[PDB]
Design a protein around this ligand. Structure first.
Ligand SMILES: N[C@@H](CCC(=O)O)C(=O)O
Ligand SMILES: N[C@@H](CCC(=O)O)C(=O)O
Ligand SMILES: N[C@@H](CCC(=O)O)C(=O)O
Lengths: 674, 674, 66
């Protein structure tokens, strides 16, 4: 044929369906499963109304007639198949007529048989009939002339052949083709492809694109016409090596992790040193590459956030180099470090140590600056790593990828890094399993939000909402809080760690500090809303806040006041995402009160929300901000990528040996841990 | 009426549907959305074929006729509604006839109007018509006499009224009723209930059970007839307080966690002491309670695993008491403990400490022995806790629950514990969110497996498979490995930490140790299979293993031999669940080789797999065995239930203060952590 | 169609279909497979032939033969 990838499938003008004998009959062959059939006819009427050309081949009429009689077969099986199929042919035709006409489309029964394709005069005749039909916006239903019949799939195939149709859809019961029988390890559902199988080869040999989907899957056509990876697609085009489809990537990375596992002593250290050197040495190439790709982005003019962050300057590269050198020098004893040293009994020395995670997969928008940072994180953390940016930066990404592939090639030399470009269909990517461990989204709310909504059955580091909170107490210095909140909002107001809210003691409404901070926000041009209690408070004041759990990002900050400490606490727990908060006051009693009561990921006392940077904590280079309730809170450095592993070196010990029989007792003496 | 709970809904003999005008028309009101309609008719034909009595009330015929004309409306809107509905009434009737008759059921159009219910002679007439119909196994379709018409829901309601029908289904577009408008925090979808709302009250006032589902939801009837919590159910029966539906439980528990948060010093310690005392003091009551419930289980005769584990003896209670006293004495400094102490600059003292998780939810089969254990875990870990056992032990569970409620009532006194009995529909339970953190399944493979398959978007501690592995090296003492594997399999062969496999160096096939261990397994009566390589090896030997990733539980152990260390490693990684493994040898070079290369949750060297007990590790009382790749590996003590929380006590510090303007620099001096 | 009477396997097939039908009190309507067609009376005649039917009625417009 001509079509090669599912991408090309929005561009086929002539289609042929062939429903399978199992998708329409109910689970008796003694009636009709209807819902599926209805879905099918609706999809088909749609693709036709679009303007594509379709010729259904409905198999399995026998069930219709078998049900329709249901009485004479009864009275004959006590006094005594094809005929039932003939009568069912009639009835089924009518039914299709009713349903299709309910979309206004008209249809016309057509009967054929395999011999009718073999003689050539009948080939002429039938093709003339079909052309005359299709020319008239009619969707002929093509059954076999059962009458002349001793599963009608070869029929559809060679039909498309004579028609030389764009794509043959072949619905069925099975989802697709596997590598091997399903009762077998390695039943790799072979989506593309280099009985039904034969006939598919055949039709391909006739220059025809074939696809085999699953009937029970909804919107299967509308699905498959989009290019979505479903069913089984067939073409030997075999254009490029395209080294990994998606997964041999993953296994490789696993292998590379196993590799670098045995290269701790200055090995990964010298390696990331090498990476920093390659960064500071060959920047001309990558600089021009980004300049080029940025020019390419300019004509697109996507988003000033994007159109600003995809930028890069040799100053940024110097920043990255010093960060990487830092990571190097301080990433000395992160892996393999033991955490416990204990003896249960003589020659029973348990110890628990540090080990990598496995197959990390980053996701982020066009920001090539992060790429080498997270790569250094991976390599210093000795675990594998995948990547997926966005659309832009792609060439820059490749340049950085080559640089880092060199950097790792020096020692260990194994490419436990990859890149999944060419629109890998993120949802399908996360649909994988058994390989990837930590989705590390990095772009912004949207990105991470779309992820959390799409991600299922896979750990997803990171947060999605930046609703912080700032409480002010009655015994807090006024100008102190003034400058504090001033900065808290007006340092990078589009940050995640931002105070999209500000809560104040009820008492301090008297000192007009509320007015003072309104003045300040005005000074900074901050569109402020008001809290319901605040709404009650003044005459008309600032407008009412839309919703307390809303997000601004821009120069906006809801403000509300409550009576007591505890009331504030409750409001926080009610609305706060447990992300970040701070208190300002001079009482340490209340201070501790807050400290404990709070349950945010991180809480402060007279500091700024903009402190949540990890690097600011001397926590090395951060990787993300996690709000999940496990293993990680907010600023996650490298140790958020290290799990443990119990090891145990006995000599001759056994389980029942520590029972009453063997003189084996318990010590649990906490040895001095290394 | 008479019916009270969705449980009662398998027992209504007369039903009435009323499709909504939005579930059938497509998103134009200019055609017909069919698939939904087909689903509806199929469900209805099903419930009727069951023997229940149904009378559809299909709204929205206008769309049918509007589509059917589509030409004269066209030519008239250039030269110039009810009539279209009349013609559509005809056509729609036919269509229903075709479809229903395809299940063999027959139908008969019936037209009414609201005034037809008001006069009484017509009430007699119409009721006679309906009774005569239903007596004849016909499903009358009840439309309104549009002809006499200036959304036909009151009609269906008062229809059911005159009929005095069991349950009125009222499909629609909306999923159900909320607490408040959806654009509002707290849109609590009020499943039960103490426009459509009015009419529902009305019909209830007529002694009629009403339900309002969502049309687009599949199997909605078959769903709702089962008793499944869907749509909106209506009854003011209000039998019992049933203190929590499901959730005020959860919030309470959150509150109780916040409570016990401020009770570290010997408070929870003395409290769990009190619990142990109550355990050792009032055991008569709970002992007889279990005796009773065990007798109740005996007549059921469910499962010797269950029928054995639900047992309890005062010796078991002594075991629990000593375990609880241990937990008490050693659970001193688990919470609030700081992990880092660092100064970034003058009066910038970050420190990271220990904090609870939140709302833990246990799940396990009838094993009341664990209940107080995990309760002690919760209370010593200062976090809330829910519970859900199975069917049996329920009364025993209540007894233990009262004991522990007392125990916590002493100090802190807040009941941050609950129990979700009366078939809370586990899948619905885990469908919750924003409350529960750690599903801690405890029963067995099934339990945890069903969980992992059902659980979505919720952390699930624990494993599901116990495929361990035992490698034997060429330089390993024979009798050593003999006794080792002997115990490894024959100590509690139904355990999770079991060696459902045994791998041997290729060389040692020569020393016939393979034969020796076959002899030993025979001694112990172990049905052994063989590996494909082993299959090749001998004449016929033991039978071929079915599948390498299978599980036995009983006295079975696949055995296979491979050439080299590394080959074994690869086979492990290929099939091993990374759960547990051990090596036996005398070379430490290979020893370390294995140690590193391996990636199991836990690996040993000359010890027994039966060592994976946590308690055996002096790890306090275990709570579970986690195989997830995050936060927890295998034996998880209490610290697997403690997260951290960054805190920070600055004086006057701000973000831009550490910029070039303010004399604020970086120290990151690792203070001696407490 | 007329060719369907000529091959014998199809003769068997179609006759089986007809016998199975008539045995079930069904009145099959016998049109020609226009689809496979470039006044269908020979068809009815030879149909009755294969069936060996008692009487062939052949309605028409003309009253009879002169
Ligand atoms: N060749 C056709 C049947 C030919 C016929 O006898 O009509 C098949 O294998 O299905
Ligand atoms: N009262 C009915 C209509 C009465 C009639 O005119 O038939 C209604 O409001 O819908
Ligand atoms: N179709 C023609 C006969 C075709 C032929 O075999 O010559 C008929 O029905 O009378």
């Amino acid at each position: 044929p001509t079509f090669t990838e599912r991408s090309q499938l929005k561009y086929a003008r002539r289609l042929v369906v062939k429903l399978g004998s199992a998708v329409i009959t109910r689970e008796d062959n003694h009636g009709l499963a209807l819902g599926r059939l209805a879905s099918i006819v609706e999809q088909v009427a749609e693709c036709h109304l679009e303007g594509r050309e379709v010729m259904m081949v409905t198999s399995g009429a026998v069930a219709f007639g078998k049900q329709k009689l249901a009485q004479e077969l009864l009275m004959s099986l006590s006094m005594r198949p094809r005929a039932a199929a003939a009568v069912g042919q009639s009835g089924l035709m009518s039914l299709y007529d009713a349903m299709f006409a309910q979309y206004g489309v008209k249809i016309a029964q057509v009967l054929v048989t395999k011999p009718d394709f073999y003689n050539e005069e009948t080939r002429n005749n039938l093709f003339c009939t079909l052309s005359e039909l299709i020319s008239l916006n009619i969707v002929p239903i093509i059954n076999t002339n059962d009458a002349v019949s001793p599963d009608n799939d070869s029929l559809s195939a060679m039909l498309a052949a004579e028609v030389q149709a764009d794509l043959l859809i072949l619905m069925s019961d099975v989802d697709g083709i596997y590598n091997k029988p399903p009762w077998e390890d390695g039943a790799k559902l072979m989506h593309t492809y280099t009985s039904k199988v034969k006939a598919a080869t055949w039709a391909l040999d006739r220059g025809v694109s074939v696809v085999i989907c699953n009937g029970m899957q909804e919107k299967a056509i509308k699905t498959i016409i989009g290019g979505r990876k479903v069913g089984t697609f067939f073409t030997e085009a075999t254009e490029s090596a395209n080294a990994v489809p998606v997964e041999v990537m993953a296994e490789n990375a696993r292998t590379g992790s196993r590799q670098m596992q045995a290269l701790t002593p200055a090995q990964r250290a010298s390696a990331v040193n090498t990476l920093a050197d390659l960064l500071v040495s060959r920047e001309k190439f990558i600089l021009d590459a980004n300049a080029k790709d940025l020019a390419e982005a300019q004509k697109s003019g996507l988003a000033k956030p994007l159109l600003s962050r995809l930028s890069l300057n040799p100053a940024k590269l110097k920043n990255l180099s010093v960060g990487l050198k830092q990571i190097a020098e301080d990433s000395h004893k992160n892996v393999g470090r033991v955490l416990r040293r204990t003896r249960l009994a003589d020659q029973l020395e348990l110890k628990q140590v540090t080990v990598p995670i496995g197959v990390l997969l980053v996701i982020f928008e066009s920001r090539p600056d992060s790429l080498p940072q997270v790569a250094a994180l991976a390599m210093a953390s000795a675990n594998g790593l995948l990547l997926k940016g966005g659309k832009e930066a792609a060439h820059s990404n490749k340049a950085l990828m080559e640089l880092v592939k060199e950097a790792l090639a020096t020692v260990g030399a194994e490419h436990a890094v990859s890149l999944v470009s060419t629109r890998e269909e993120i949802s399908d990517l996360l649909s994988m399993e058994n390989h990837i461990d930590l989705i590390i989204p990095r772009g912004s709310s949207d990105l991470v939000r779309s992820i959390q909504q799409q991600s299922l059955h896979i750990p997803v580091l990171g947060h999605a909402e930046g609703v912080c909170h700032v409480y002010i107490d009655r015994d807090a210095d006024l100008e102190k809080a003034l400058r504090i909140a001033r900065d808290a909002k007006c340092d990078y107001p589009a940050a995640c760690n931002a105070m999209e809210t500000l809560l104040i003691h009820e008492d301090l409404m008297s000192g007009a500090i509320f007015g003072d901070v309104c003045n300040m926000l005005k000074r900074e041009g901050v569109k402020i809303y008001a809290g319901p209690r605040l709404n009650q408070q003044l005459t008309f004041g600032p407008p009412a806040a839309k919703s307390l759990k809303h997000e601004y990002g821009a120069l906006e900050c809801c403000i509300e006041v409550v009576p007591s400490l505890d009331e504030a606490i409750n409001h926080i727990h009610t609305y706060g995402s447990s992300h970040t908060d701070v208190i300002v006051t001079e009482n340490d009693a209340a201070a501790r009160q807050f400290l404990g009561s709070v349950d945010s990921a991180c809480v402060f006392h007279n500091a700024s929300s903009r402190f949540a940077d990890g690097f600011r904590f001397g926590l090395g280079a951060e990787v993300g901000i996690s709000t999940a309730r496990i293993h990680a809170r907010g600023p996650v450095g490298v140790e958020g990528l290290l799990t443990t592993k119990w090891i145990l070196e006995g000599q001759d010990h056994a389980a029942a040996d520590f029972a009453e029989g063997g003189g084996r007792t318990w010590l649990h003496e906490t040895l001095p841990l290394d």
